Tab-separated table of C-alpha atoms and ligand atoms in Angstrom:
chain	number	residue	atom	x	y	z
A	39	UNK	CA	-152.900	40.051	244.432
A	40	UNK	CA	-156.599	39.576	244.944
A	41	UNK	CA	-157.858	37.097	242.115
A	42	UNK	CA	-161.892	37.041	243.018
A	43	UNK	CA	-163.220	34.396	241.138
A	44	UNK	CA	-166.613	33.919	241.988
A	45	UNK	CA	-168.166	30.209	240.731
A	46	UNK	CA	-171.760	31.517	240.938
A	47	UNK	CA	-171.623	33.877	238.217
A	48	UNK	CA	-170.359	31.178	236.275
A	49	UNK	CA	-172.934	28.617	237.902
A	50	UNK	CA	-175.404	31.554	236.476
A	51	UNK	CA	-174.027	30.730	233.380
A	52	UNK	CA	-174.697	27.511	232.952
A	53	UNK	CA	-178.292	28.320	234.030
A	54	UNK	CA	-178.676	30.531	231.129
A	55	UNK	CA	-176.673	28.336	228.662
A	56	UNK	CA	-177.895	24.968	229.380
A	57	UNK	CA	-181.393	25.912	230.987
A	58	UNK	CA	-182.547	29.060	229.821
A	59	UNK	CA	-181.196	28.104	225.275
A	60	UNK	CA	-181.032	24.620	226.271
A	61	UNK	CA	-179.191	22.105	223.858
A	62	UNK	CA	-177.215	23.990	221.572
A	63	UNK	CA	-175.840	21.817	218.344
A	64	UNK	CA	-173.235	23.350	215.988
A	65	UNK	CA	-175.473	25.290	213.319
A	66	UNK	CA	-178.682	25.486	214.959
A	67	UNK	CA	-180.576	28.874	216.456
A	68	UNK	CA	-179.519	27.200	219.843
A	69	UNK	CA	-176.205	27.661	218.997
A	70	UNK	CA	-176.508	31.366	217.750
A	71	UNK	CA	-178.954	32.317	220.172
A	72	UNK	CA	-175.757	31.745	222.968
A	73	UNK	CA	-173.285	33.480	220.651
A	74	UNK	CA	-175.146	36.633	220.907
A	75	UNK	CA	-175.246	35.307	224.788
A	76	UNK	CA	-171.671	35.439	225.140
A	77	UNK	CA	-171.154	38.238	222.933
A	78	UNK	CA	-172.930	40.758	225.155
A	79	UNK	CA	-171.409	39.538	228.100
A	80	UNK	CA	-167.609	40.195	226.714
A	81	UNK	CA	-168.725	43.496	225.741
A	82	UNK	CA	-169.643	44.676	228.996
A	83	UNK	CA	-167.003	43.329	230.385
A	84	UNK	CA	-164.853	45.595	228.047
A	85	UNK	CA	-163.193	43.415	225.569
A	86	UNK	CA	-163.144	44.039	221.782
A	87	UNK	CA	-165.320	41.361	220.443
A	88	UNK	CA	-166.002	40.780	216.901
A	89	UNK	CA	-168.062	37.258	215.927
A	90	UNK	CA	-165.716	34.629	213.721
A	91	UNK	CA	-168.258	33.531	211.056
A	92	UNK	CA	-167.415	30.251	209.208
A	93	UNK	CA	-169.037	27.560	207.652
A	94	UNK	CA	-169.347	23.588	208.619
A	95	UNK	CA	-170.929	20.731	207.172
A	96	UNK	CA	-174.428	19.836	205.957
A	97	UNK	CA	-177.042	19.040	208.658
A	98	UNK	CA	-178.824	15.296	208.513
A	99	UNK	CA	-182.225	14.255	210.311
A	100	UNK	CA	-185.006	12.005	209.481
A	101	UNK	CA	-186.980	8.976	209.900
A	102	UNK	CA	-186.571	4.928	210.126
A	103	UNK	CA	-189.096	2.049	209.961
A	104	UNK	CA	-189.626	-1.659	209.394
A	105	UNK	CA	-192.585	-3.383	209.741
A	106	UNK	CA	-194.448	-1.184	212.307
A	107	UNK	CA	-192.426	0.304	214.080
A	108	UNK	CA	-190.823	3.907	214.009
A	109	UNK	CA	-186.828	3.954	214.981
A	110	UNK	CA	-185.224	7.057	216.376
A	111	UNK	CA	-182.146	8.394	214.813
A	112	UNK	CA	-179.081	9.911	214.986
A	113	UNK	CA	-177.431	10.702	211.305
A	114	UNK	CA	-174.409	11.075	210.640
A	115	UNK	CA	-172.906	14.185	209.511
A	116	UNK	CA	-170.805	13.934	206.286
A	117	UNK	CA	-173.001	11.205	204.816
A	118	UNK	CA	-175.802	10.764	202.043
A	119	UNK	CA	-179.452	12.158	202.146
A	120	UNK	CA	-181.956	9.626	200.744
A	121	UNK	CA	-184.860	11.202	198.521
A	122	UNK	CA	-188.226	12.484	199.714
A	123	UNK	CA	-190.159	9.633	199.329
A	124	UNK	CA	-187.277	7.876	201.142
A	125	UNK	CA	-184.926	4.780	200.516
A	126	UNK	CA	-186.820	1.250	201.041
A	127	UNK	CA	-184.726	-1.671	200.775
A	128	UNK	CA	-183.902	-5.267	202.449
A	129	UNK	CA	-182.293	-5.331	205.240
A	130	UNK	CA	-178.765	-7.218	205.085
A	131	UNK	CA	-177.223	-8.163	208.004
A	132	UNK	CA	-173.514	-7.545	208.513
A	133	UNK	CA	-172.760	-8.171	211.755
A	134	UNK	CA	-169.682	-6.161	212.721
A	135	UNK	CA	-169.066	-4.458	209.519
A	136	UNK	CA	-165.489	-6.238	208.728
A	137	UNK	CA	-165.161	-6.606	204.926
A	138	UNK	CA	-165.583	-10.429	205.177
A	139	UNK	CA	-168.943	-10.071	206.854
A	140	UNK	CA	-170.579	-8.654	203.269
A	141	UNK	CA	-171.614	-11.705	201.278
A	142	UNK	CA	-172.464	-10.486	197.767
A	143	UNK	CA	-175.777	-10.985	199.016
A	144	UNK	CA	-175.353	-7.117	200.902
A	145	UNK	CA	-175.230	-6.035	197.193
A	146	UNK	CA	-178.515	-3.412	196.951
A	147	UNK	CA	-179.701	-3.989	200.900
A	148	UNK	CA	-179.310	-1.402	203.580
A	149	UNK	CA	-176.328	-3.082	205.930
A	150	UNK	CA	-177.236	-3.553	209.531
A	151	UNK	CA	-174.378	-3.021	211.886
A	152	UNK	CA	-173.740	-4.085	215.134
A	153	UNK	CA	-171.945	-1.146	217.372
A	154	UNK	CA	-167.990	-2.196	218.213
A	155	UNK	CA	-164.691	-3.272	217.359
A	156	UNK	CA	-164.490	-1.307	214.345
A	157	UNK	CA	-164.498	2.679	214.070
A	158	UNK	CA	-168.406	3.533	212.455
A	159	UNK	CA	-166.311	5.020	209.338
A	160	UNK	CA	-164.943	1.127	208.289
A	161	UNK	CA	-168.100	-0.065	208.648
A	162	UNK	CA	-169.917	2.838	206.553
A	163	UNK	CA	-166.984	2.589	203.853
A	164	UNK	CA	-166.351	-1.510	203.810
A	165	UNK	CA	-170.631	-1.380	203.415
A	166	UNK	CA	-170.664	0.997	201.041
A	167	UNK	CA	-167.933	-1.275	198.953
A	168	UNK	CA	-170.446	-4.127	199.176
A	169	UNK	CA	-173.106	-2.455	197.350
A	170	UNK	CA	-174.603	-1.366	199.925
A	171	UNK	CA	-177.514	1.258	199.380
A	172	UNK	CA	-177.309	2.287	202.965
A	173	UNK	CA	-175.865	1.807	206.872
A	174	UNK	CA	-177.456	1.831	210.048
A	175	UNK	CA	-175.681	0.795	212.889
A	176	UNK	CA	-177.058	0.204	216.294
A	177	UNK	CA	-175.917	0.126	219.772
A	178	UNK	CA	-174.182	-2.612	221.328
A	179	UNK	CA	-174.749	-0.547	224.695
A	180	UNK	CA	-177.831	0.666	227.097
A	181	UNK	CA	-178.981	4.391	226.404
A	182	UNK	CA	-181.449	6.897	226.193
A	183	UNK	CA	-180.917	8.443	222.776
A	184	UNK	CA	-179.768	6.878	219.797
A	185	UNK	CA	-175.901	6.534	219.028
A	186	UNK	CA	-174.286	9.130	216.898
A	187	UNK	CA	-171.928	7.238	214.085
A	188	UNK	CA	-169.226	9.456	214.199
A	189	UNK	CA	-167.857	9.192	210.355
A	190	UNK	CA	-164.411	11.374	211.674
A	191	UNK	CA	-164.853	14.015	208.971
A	192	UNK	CA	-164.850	11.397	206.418
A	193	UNK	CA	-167.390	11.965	203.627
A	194	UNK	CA	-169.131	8.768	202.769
A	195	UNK	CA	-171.476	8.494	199.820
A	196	UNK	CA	-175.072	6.758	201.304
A	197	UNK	CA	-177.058	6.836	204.427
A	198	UNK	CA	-175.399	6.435	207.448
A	199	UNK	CA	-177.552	6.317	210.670
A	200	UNK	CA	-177.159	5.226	214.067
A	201	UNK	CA	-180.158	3.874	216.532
A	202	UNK	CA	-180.703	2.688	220.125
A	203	UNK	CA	-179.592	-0.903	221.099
A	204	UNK	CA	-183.209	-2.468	221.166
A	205	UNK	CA	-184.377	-1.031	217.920
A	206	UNK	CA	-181.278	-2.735	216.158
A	207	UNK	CA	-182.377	-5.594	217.712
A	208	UNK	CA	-185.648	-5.616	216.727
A	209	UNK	CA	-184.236	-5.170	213.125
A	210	UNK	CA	-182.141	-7.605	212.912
A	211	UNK	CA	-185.219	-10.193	212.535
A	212	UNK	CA	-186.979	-7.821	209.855
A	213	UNK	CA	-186.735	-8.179	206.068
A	214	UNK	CA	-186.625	-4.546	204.956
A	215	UNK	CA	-186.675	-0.616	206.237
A	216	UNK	CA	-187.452	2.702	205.022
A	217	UNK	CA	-185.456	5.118	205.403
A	218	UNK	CA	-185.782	9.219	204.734
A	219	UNK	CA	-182.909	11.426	205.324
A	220	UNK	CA	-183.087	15.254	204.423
A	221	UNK	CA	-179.345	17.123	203.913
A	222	UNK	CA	-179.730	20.879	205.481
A	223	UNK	CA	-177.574	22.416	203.629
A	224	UNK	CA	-175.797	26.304	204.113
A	225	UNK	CA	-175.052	25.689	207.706
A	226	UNK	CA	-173.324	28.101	209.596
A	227	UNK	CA	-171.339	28.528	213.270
A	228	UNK	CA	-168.941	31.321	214.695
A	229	UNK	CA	-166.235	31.981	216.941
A	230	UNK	CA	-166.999	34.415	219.794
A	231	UNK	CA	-163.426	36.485	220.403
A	232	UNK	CA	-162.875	39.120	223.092
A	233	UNK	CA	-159.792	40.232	223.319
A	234	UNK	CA	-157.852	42.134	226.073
A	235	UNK	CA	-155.225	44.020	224.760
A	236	UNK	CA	-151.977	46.403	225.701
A	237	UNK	CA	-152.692	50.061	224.634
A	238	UNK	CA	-148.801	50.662	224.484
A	239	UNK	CA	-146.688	47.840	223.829
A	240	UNK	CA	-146.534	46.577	219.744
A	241	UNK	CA	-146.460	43.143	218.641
A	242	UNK	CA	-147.286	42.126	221.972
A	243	UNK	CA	-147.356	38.253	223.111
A	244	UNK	CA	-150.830	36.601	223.042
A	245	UNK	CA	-152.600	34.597	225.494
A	246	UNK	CA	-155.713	32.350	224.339
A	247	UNK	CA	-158.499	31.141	226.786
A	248	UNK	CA	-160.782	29.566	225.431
A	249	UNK	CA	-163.552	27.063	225.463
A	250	UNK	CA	-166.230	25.556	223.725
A	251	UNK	CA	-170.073	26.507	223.731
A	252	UNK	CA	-171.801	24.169	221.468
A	253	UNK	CA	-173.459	20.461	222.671
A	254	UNK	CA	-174.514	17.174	221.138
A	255	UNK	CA	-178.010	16.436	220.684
A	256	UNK	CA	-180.174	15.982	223.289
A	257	UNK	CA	-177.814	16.734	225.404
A	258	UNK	CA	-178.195	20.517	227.437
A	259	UNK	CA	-174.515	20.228	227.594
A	260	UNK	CA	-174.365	21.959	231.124
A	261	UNK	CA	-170.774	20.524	231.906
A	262	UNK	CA	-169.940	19.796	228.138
A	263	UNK	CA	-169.473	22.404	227.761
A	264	UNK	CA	-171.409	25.418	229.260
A	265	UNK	CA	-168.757	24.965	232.853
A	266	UNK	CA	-165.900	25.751	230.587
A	267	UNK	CA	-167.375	28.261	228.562
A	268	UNK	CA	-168.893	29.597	232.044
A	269	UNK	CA	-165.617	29.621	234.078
A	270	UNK	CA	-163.781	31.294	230.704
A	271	UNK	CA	-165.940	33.982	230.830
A	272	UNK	CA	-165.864	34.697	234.774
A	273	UNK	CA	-161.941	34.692	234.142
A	274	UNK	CA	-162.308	37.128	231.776
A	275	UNK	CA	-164.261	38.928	234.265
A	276	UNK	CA	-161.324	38.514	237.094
A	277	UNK	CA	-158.574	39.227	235.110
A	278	UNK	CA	-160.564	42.718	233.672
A	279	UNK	CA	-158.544	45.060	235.840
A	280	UNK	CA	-155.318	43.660	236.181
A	281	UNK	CA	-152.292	45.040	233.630
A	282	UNK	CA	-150.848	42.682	231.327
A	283	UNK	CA	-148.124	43.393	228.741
A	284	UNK	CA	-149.931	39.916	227.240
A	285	UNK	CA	-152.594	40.268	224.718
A	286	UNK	CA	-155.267	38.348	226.069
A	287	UNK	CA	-158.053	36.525	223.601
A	288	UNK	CA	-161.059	35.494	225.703
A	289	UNK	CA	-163.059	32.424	222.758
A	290	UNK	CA	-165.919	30.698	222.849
A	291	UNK	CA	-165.348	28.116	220.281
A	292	UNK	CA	-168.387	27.084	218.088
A	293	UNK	CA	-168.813	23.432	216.976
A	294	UNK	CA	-166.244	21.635	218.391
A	295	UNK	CA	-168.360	18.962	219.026
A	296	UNK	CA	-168.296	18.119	214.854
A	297	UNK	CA	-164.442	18.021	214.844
A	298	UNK	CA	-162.839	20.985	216.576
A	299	UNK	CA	-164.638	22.933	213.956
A	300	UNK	CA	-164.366	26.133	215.495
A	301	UNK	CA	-160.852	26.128	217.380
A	302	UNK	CA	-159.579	24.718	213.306
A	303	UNK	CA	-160.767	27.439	212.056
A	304	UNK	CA	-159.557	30.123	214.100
A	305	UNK	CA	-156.080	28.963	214.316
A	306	UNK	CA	-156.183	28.482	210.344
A	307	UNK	CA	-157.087	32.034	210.052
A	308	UNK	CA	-154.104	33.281	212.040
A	309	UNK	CA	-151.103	35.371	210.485
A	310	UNK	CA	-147.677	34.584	209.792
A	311	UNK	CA	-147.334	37.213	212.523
A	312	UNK	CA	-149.775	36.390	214.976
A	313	UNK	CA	-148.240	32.695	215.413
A	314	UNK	CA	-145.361	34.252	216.104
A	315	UNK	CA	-146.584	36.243	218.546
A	316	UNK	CA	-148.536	33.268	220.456
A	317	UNK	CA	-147.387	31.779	223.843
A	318	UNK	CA	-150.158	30.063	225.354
A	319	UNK	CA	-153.213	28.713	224.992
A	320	UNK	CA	-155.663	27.390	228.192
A	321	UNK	CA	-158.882	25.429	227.272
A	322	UNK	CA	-161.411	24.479	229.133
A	323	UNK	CA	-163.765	21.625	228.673
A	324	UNK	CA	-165.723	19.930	231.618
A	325	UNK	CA	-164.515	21.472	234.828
A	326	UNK	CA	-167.608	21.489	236.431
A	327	UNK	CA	-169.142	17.969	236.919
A	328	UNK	CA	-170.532	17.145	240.737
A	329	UNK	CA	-168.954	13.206	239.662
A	330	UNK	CA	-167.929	12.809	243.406
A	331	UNK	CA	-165.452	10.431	241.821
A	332	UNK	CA	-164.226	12.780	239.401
A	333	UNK	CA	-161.548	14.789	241.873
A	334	UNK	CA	-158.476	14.892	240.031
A	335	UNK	CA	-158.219	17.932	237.739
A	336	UNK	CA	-156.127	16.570	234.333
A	337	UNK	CA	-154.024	19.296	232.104
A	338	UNK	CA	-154.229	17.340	228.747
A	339	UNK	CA	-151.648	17.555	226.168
A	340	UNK	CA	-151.562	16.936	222.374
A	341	UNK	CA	-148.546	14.516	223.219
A	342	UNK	CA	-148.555	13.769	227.157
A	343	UNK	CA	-145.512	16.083	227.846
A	344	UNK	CA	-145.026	19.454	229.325
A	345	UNK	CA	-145.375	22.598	228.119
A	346	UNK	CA	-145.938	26.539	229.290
A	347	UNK	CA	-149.500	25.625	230.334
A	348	UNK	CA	-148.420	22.546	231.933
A	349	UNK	CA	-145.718	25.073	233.929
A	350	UNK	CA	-147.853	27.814	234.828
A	351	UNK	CA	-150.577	25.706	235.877
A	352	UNK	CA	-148.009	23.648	238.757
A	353	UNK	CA	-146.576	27.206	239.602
A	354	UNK	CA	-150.156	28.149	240.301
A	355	UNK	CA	-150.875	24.761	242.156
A	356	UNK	CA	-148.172	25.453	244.817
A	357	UNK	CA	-149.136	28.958	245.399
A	358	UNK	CA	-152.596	28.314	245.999
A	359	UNK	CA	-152.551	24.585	247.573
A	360	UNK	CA	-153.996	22.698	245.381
A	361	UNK	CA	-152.651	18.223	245.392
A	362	UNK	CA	-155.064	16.843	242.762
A	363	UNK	CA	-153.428	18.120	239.588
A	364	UNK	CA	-151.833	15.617	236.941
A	365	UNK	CA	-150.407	16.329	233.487
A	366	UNK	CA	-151.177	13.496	231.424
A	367	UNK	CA	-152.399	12.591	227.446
A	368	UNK	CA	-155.253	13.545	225.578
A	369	UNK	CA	-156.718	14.977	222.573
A	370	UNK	CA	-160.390	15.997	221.407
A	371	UNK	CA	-160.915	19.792	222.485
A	372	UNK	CA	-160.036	23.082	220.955
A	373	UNK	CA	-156.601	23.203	222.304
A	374	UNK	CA	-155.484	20.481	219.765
A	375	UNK	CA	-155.590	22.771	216.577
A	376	UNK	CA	-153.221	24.984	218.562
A	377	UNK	CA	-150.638	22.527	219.312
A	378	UNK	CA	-150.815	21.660	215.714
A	379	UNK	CA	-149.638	25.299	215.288
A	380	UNK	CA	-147.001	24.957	217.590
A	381	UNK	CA	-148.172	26.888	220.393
A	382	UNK	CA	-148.043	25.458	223.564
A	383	UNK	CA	-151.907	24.362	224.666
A	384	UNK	CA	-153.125	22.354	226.991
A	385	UNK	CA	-157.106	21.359	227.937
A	386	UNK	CA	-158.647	21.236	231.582
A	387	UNK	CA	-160.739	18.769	232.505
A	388	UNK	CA	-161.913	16.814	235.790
A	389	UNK	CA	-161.744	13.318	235.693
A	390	UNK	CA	-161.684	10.322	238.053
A	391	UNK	CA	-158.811	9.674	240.240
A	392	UNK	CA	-158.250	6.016	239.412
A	393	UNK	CA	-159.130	5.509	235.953
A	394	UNK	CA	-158.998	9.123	234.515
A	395	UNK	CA	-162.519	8.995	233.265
A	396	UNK	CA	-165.516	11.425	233.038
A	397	UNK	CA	-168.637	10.851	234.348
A	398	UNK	CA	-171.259	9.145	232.820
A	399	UNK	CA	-173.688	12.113	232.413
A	400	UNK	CA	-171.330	13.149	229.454
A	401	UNK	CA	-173.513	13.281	226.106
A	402	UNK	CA	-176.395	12.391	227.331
A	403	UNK	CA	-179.558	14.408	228.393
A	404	UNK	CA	-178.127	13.728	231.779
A	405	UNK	CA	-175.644	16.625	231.303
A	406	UNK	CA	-177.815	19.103	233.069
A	407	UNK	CA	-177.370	21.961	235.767
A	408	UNK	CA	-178.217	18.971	238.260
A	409	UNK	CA	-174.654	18.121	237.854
A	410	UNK	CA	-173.043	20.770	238.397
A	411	UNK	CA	-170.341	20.982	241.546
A	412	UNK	CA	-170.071	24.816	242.505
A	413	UNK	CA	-167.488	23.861	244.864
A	414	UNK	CA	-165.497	22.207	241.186
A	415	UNK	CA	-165.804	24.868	239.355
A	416	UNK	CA	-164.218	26.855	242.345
A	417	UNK	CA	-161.126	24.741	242.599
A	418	UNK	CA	-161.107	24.826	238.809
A	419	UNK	CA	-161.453	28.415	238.219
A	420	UNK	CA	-159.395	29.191	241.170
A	421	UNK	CA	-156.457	27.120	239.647
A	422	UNK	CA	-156.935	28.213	235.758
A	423	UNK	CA	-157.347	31.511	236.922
A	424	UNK	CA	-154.133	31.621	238.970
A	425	UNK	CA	-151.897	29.975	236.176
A	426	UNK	CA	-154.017	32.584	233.840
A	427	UNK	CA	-152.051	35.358	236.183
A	428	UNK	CA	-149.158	33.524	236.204
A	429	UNK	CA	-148.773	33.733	232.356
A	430	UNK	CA	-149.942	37.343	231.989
A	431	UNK	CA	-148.935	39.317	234.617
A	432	UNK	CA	-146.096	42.337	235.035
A	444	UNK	CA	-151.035	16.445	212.842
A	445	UNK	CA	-153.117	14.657	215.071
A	446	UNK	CA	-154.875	11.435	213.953
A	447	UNK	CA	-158.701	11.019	214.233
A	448	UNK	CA	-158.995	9.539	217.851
A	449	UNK	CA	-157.251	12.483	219.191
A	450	UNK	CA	-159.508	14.862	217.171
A	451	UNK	CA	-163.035	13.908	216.723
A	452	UNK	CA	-165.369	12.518	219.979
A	453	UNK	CA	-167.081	8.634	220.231
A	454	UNK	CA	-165.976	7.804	216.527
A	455	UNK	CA	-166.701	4.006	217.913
B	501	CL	CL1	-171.453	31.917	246.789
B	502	ZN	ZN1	-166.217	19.249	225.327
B	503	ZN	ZN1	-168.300	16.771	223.903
């Protein structure tokens, strides 16, 4: 059968995503500006769509100086706002943030932290401990935007920012800071779900394809992840007129990108009955970088071994010649709440030949249109798509859910 997936309608999608809204970060209007994006586009491609409302964390930003100078920041979601007029206090210096570092001396200081070794939560909590009144850790590496301290859904109880390499630097030789750090609070993101579904059979087996359409700051999030959210919808678009006995869920996952938010959840929210009914779930997430190293396409599982995804997907490889394809580990994407269910999931993702890595684009402002392959999200839709057909047709720790928690 003729499966015409066409990458430049996705390609267009990226446009509109990543160009057109621009950065979209779990809670913002960027974020529900694309949901009603996405929305309309199921629609007229004739799937019942309703919009998953739920609710996520407080939202942090603010300000940092010392002396004269004015520090850009990342905060830290999960962690304490400081009052209007802001938090001034000495600056301690702790080094690497191991409990031995903290002399009693850290007792009422803001604790300066040193990116590495340790995840950013230890450092927030064994500071916090030490009397800390706040925690701002800087980078140990080169970048453009300051670091996010990823606290890995941890609530921790005062400030905790992150800054560029430089500015930490700077700090380190300073004897106090102010800091002011505003909690938005009522913050909201949904679940777009279109679903494709068999007018006569009952209790029919479902089908989830799904990706994630929300991005880290700063970052237009053109391959992480508007490609996978862009090649998910142009499936949906394929696989419109072909009969399946399978119901078929077409989801765009909000916030992922704060701890699987979304994908959590949805699969929370699921029946007794529904989980029962599920079979499969395909995710996408990065399938479109233009890496020229990045050629081997990786089918990530919860726990590195096969599954129906993993089976469908080197069915599909063989029928349509395809070489580069390699099951292997890995968390971090909306699939994971799934195989905590016990359905079989599995994520897509390109990634370098050698050492498995993404590019370096990832999370950065970098992460634009500009670097986008159409020819990789061919060979990745083409493939999904095919082990799609194939399917349809007549606890995890912290590291393995959250992203750069150190
Ligand atoms: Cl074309
Ligand atoms: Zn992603
Ligand atoms: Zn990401």
């Amino acid at each position: 059968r003729e499966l015409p997936f066409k990458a430049k309608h996705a390609y267009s999608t990226i446009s509109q995503l990543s160009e057109a809204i621009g950065p979209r970060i779990a809670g913002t209007a960027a974020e529900k500006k694309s949901a009603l994006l996405i929305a309309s586009s199921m629609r007229k491609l004739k799937l019942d769509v309703k919009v998953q409302r739920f609710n996520i964390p407080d939202r942090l930003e603010g300000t940092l100086s010392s002396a004269g100078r004015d520090i850009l920041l990342q905060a830290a979601s999960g962690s304490a706002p400081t009052e209007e007029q802001g938090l001034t206090a000495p600056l301690y210096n702790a080094g690497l943030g191991y409990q031995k570092d903290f002399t009693a001396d850290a007792k009422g200081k803001i604790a300066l932290i040193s990116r590495g070794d340790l995840t950013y939560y230890e450092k927030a909590k064994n500071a916090e401990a030490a009397g800390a009144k706040a925690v701002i850790i800087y980078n140990n590496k080169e970048s453009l935007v300051p670091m996010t301290p990823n606290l890995s859904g941890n609530k921790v109880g005062i400030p905790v920012v992150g800054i560029k390499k430089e500015d930490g630097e700077a700090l380190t030789q300073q004897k106090e800071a102010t800091l002011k750090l505003k909690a938005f609070t009522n913050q909201t993101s949904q679940n777009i779900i279109g679903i494709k579904k068999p007018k006569n059979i009952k209790h029919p087996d479902i089908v989830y394809v799904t990706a994630h359409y929300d991005s880290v700051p700063f970052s237009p999030g053109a391959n992480d992840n508007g490609s996978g959210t862009s090649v998910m919808l142009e499936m949906a678009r394929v696989l419109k007129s072909v009969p399946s006995d399978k119901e078929i869920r077409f989801i765009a996952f909000g916030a992922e990108e704060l701890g699987l938010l979304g994908s959590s959840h949805y699969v929370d929210h699921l029946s007794e009955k529904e989980l029962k009914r599920s079979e499969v779930n395909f995710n996408l997430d990065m399938v479109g970088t233009s890496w020229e190293k990045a050629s081997e396409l990786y089918v990530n599982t919860l726990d590195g071994q096969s599954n129906y995804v993993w089976e469908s997907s080197r069915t599909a490889a063989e029928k349509i010649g395809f070489d580069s394809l390699s099951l292997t580990q890995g968390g971090s994407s909306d699939h994971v709440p799934f195989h905590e269910a016990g359905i079989d999931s599995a994520n897509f993702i390109w990634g370098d030949p050698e050492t498995e890595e993404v590019e370096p684009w990832y999370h950065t402002p970098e992460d634009s249109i500009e670097h986008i392959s159409k020819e990789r999200l061919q060979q990745a839709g083409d493939l999904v798509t095919a082990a799609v057909y194939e399917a349809v047709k007549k606890k995890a720790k912290a590291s393995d859910i959250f992203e750069d928690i150190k």
